[PDB]
Amino acid sequence: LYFQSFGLMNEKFEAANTSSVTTNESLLTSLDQKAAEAKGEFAKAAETAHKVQAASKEFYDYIGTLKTQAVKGFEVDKETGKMPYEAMDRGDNIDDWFTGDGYTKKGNEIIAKIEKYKSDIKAALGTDKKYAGIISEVEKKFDVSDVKNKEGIKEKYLAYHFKGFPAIASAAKLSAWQNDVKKTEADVYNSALGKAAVAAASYSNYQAIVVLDKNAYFQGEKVTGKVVLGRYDENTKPTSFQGPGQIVNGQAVISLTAGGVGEQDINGQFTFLEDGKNIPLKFSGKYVVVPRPNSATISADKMNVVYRGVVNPISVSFAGVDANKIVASAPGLSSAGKPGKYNMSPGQGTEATISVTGTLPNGDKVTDKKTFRIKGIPGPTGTIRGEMGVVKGPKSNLEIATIGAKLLDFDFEVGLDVVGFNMKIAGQPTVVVTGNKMNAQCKSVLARAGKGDQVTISEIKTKLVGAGSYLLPRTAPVIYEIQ
Amino acid sequence: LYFQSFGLMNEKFEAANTSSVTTNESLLTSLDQKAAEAKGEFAKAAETAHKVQAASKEFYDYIGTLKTQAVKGFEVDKETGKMPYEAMDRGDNIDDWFTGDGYTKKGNEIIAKIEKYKSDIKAALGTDKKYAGIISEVEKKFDVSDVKNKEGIKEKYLAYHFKGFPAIASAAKLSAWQNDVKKTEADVYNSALGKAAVAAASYSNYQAIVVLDKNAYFQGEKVTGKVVLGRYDENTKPTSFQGPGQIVNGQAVISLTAGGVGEQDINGQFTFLEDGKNIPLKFSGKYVVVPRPNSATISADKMNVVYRGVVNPISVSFAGVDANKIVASAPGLSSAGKPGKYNMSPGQGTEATISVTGTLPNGDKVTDKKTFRIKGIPGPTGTIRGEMGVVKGPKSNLEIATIGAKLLDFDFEVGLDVVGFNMKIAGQPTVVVTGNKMNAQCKSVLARAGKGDQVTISEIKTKLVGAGSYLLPRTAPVIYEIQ
C-alpha cells in the first residue's frame, strides 16, 4: 500500500546528491588551491582527486540514465516536481535489461559500467594504505556477483535487484548508489588532502643545523647560537627567493665575494603564497670583513738598547689590538705625541722593561713586555779647533784654541761642553785647566815650545746636556803638534 | 506486495554500518597515533574527533533502540539472522511514540535526542570553515521541523515519517539515519586529521635563517653558506634533543664555554617518533678556538741599525702567520738556526731593507718590510798595556809594550789587531812603526827620555776581524807618561 515510503527514501537520497555536488566541489577546490600554492604532495593529491572526479562523474551520470528509464512515462508535477509515487508500482520500463534468465546487451552494459567504476577507482587510487578502506568499500557496495535467493539458487544481480520491482523502489535504490558514489568521492578528496599534508609535515623533511652567532672564539668565551630544524625537501617550493643563490630542495646555497671592511649583511627573503595571503620570511645574515695581517716585527737583537741621560724614542704596537686600546708603561716612559709613540729616559739600573696592555674588542686584556738594556752614553772624543787625534798648525792657533768633545755616530742630539782638561809640554809639569780655553798659565808654559813640539790635551772633563746634565767620566785625549 | 525491497534496503544499510565501525575505528587510530607522536595540532584534532565519537555513539546507539522497538515481536531466523519481511507490514510497535495529533513522553524524547546530537556535533566542532559543511549537512539531514503533507498542513516529523508505516520500512529509515551518523563521523575524523596536518605544514611555522660556513672573512674571499627555513613552532615537539641547550618553539638556544685550541664540534641530535619509526636528525656544528693576541712590537726608533763587517742577529715574526710560513729576505741575510732567527752582514750602501712574506692558512700572501741604517764600526780607542788615555809607569814597561785597540760598549765579539802606529818623543822626529810593538828605532829614540816625559802613540792602524777583515780608518791616540 505504501509507495510514499519509497518516495520519501528517494527524496532524501536526491537531496543528499544535490547537497553533495556543492560540498564535494568545495573540497576539491580546497585541494586545488593547496596544490597550486604549496605544490609537492598537494599536487600529487590533486592528480589523484581529479582521476576519481572523472570516474565518479561517469558512473553517477550513467546511474542517472538508468533512473530516468525506471521512472519513464510518469509525469513529474509542474510546480512541486515530484512523481506520482502511487502510480509507480510496476517495473515494465526496465524489462529491456533482461532476456529470459539472463541479460540483454543493455543489462551486460550496466554491469560493465559498474565494473569500470570499481576498476577506475582502484587504478586512480594506488595500493597505498591511506586508500585501502575506500577501495574495499567500493568493491563491497558494488559487488555485482550473483545473489542467492530463499531457495539458495543464484540469481543475476540486476534481475535480483530490479526485475519486476516497483518503479519508485528502483529509483530509490539507484539514488542510494548515487549517494555511495558521492560519499566515496568526498572520502577521496578529504583522504588525499590529508595524506599529502601528513607527508609535507613529516620530520623526514628536515636537516638539524647549528647556526652559531660567530664561528671563531677565544678560550673561555661564551659560544652562542641555536640548533634548528631546517627544511630539506624537494617538494618545498618557495613562491620566490631573493638572495645570492638559488633554491635547491627548499634551501638556497649562497655565495658572494666578501665586501670591503667591517660588519656586513646578507639580506633577502622567501615568499610563500598561502590561503590567499603572501607569507614573507625575511632574513639578515651577518658576516665581518677583517683586514689581512700586514705588520711584521723585524728587530736587530743586539740593538735593544736605551741610553741613560738621553730621550730614547720608542714605538709600540700590538697586532690584533686597536692602537687606541694599547697602553705602555715603564719608569722613565712618557708619550711622544703620536699614537703608539713614546719617549724613554731610563732611571738607574742595567735594564728597563716596557709593559704593554691591550684591550680586545670583547673587553679582554692582553699583556706583553720587552726589556731593554740601559747603557751609559759612549765616551766622547776630545778635540782642538774641532779636530780629533793629532791637530797640526802654528803655536798661535793653540793659544787661542777651544778644547771640545765629539760623540761620533751617536744618533741623539745632545749638548757637550768641556769644563776642564790637562795640558802638557815636555820639560814642564802638567797644567790643570778649569774651562775649555788655554790659561795664562798655559800660554807661559808654552813660551818654550816651537816647531816639532807636541802638546797633549788629556783628562778632558766633558759635561753633557740631554735629559738632564752629567759629568762624563772619560773623553779620549787629543794632541797638538806645532808646525 | 514488495516488503523484500524494504528488506534489501535495510540489509544494505546495516552492512554499511558493520563495515563503518571498523573503518571509522581505523581512521580514529591513525589520528590518535599521529596525536601521540607529533602532538601540536594533531592533539587538538584528536580532542575534536573524540568529542564527535561520543556524540555519534550516543545517537547511533539510541537509533538502535528505536529500531529494536520497530521490529518487536518478529522472530529473526536462527541461522540466517534475517527477519520475516512479508510479516512486517504494520507499525503497531511504535504507537506509543504518538498520542492523538501529538507525541507521548517517548516521542518528545526521540526529538530531544536528535536535537542533542546536532547540538553536540555543533559544540564539538567549532565555527571553523573546515567543519562548516559537515555541520550544515547534520542540520539538513536531521531537520526535525514539521513536514507539510499533500494538503499543505503541517504534520509532526515522527508522525509524518513513522506513524502507521510497515515495520520493515521504519527499520530501513532508521538504519539510513545510522549510515548518516557513521558517514559524518568519518568525515570529521578525516577532516580533523587534514586540518591539523595543513596547519603543521603552514609556512607561517618557519624563520628564514642564514647559516654561513664562517662568520669572518678577508676582502675577496668567497663567503659560503646556505639560507634555510628553520622550524619555529610551539607545536614542534621533538621526542628528544641532545645538545648544549633546551627546546623552545622547536629550536634549541645553545651555549658553551669555548674549548682549548683549534677546530671544535658541537655534536648532538633531535629524535622524532613517527609512524612507528624513530627519526634521528644528527648535527655536528663547528667552531674554532683561536689564541688571543699575545705579542707586542716594542722598538727603540734610533736603534734600527746594522753594522758593516759584523754578524747582526735579526728576529722576525709576523702576527697572524705561523712561524713556519714566514720568509725573510735581504742582501746579506741568512738563517741563524732557530725559527724566525736570522743574521745580517750588510753590503755596501747606507740602508738594508729586510722583506718579509707570510702565507696565511687560506694560502694568501702578506708582505711587510723594514729598513735598517748601515753604520760603519765605531772608531776603536788606542791602548798601551791594555790601558787607554794616559798610561803611566817606567820607561822599561813602554819599550816591551804592546800597542792595542778597544771597542768600548760594542755588543759584537770581534777581533782587533794593531798593524801600525806613530811614536813621538820631544826633540826627535816621529817614528813610523809597522807592527804593534816598539821598534829598535823606537828604543834608540827613547834613550833620551826619562821621568816626566810623555810619548804619544797616534795614527794607530787597527785591523778588524768579524765577518771579513777591514783596516779601520781611525783609532783614538794613546799617551805614555814615564814616572
Residue numbers in the entry:
A (entry chain A), B (entry chain A): -5 to -1, 36 to 513
The authors write:
PorM (or GldM) is therefore a central structural component of the T9SS and an interesting target for structure and function studies. Here, we present the atomic structures of the periplasmic domains of both PorM and GldM, that exhibit 22% amino-acid identity, and provide information regarding the contribution of each domain for interaction with PorK and PorN. Finally, we suggest that due to the structural similarity between PorM and GldM, both classical T9SS and Gld T9SS membrane core complexes might assemble and function in similar ways.
The GldM (accession number GI: 58531935) and PorM periplasmic domains (GI: 188595218) (GldMp, PorMp) were cloned from residues 36–513 and 36–516, respectively. One molecule was present in the asymmetric unit, but strong contacts exist with a symmetry-related protein in the crystal. The dimer structure contains four domains, D1–D4 with seven α-helices and 22 β-strands in the sequence (α1−α2−α3−α4−α5) (β1−β2−β3−β4−β5−β6) (β7−β8−β9−β10−β11−β12−β13−β14) (β15−β16−α6−β17−β18−β19−α7−β20−β21−β22). Domain D1 (32-232) is formed by helices 1–5 in an up and down fold. Each D2 domain swaps its β-strands 1 and 2 with the other D2 domain, whereas D3 domains swap β-strand 7. The D4 domains (406–513) are not subject to domain swapping but are packed together in the dimer. Remarkably, with a 180 Å-extended conformation, GldM spans most of the periplasmic space, as the distances between the IM and OM associated with T3SS, T4SS, and T6SS have been found to be ~26013, ~17014, and 180 Å15, respectively.
